[PDB]
Amino acid sequence: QELQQIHQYIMALREEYFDPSIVGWTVKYYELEEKIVSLIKNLLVALK
């Protein structure tokens, strides 16, 4: 469960203190981050 909190914290920083040139370019990065977070969470679930 803590992985989602960490992922949300990381994603929010991209906009909290920065103003990226175009917003649409951030969402692709967020999707890739979600891919990786899903991988890690899948491993964690499989352990049990």
Report how far apart, in Å, the C-alpha atoms of 38 and of each of 9, 13, 16, 20, 45 are: 16, 20, 24, 25, 10
- Show the tokens assigned to 27: 């969402």
Contacts 24+ apart (CB under 8 A), 18-27: none
Q: What method was applied to determine this entry?
A: cryo-EM
15-26 CB burial, b ≥16 within 10 A, e <16: eeeeeeeeeeee
Resolution rounded to one decimal, in angstroms: 9.0
